[PDB]
């Protein structure tokens, strides 16, 4: 996905599962 977030995201999912 070229429109995915290309920045560092501290609020992204940090767990192994969704």
């Amino acid at each position: 996905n070229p429109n995915a977030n290309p920045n560092a995201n501290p609020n992204a999912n940090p767990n192994a599962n969704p």
Partner: antibody
Amino acid sequence: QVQLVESGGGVVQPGRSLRLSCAASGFTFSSYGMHWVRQAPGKGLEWVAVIWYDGSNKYYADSVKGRFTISRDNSKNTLYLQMNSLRAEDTAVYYCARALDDASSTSCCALDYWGQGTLVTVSS
Amino acid sequence: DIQMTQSPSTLSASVGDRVTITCRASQSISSWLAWYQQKPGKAPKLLIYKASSLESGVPSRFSGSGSGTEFTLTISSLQPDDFATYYCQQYNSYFTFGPGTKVDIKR
């Protein structure tokens, strides 16, 4: 203040190579995705390429695929565009641009800071 | 690709006018739409993102609206430094720009 200082543009013949640079300051460069956008003389804006903050993923416009390569050196806070097999249609002012960080959005990107631009003239 | 169009090409305006320019997409882009300003010889400047969110540092007389395939940039009271060209840009599928709308000085 956020600054994006570009260099490397110039006059080259069709089929030659040229390397653009975009030196960043005033923000944390290694945490931002970056774009190249070009503007032909008298025309509008055309997206060229994007690179992830860590340099992992890269995407290109169809008109430059196989010929252009986007890269970055986060230790030097510099973005690069390697332009090979240049055509006369590549003649344009090239801008580097930082990807906007909109925390709530699930699609990307808007471009919130732009370099001053560097002129690439491909001519025989 | 998603094709962006704009109307008008040149819009005649005077200081103080309420000005609207329209941007269209060849298919729905939801709300993933940005507006930029550009002056001759200068770099584009982000005005609006996500169709209606005002970029920080941009004057409040600028606002955006719309969704799907129809979008509008509104300047509530045009000021002298607003005479310029304005581009819309979608980021729902890759990244494409409209042809631009120039706002010049009415006489």
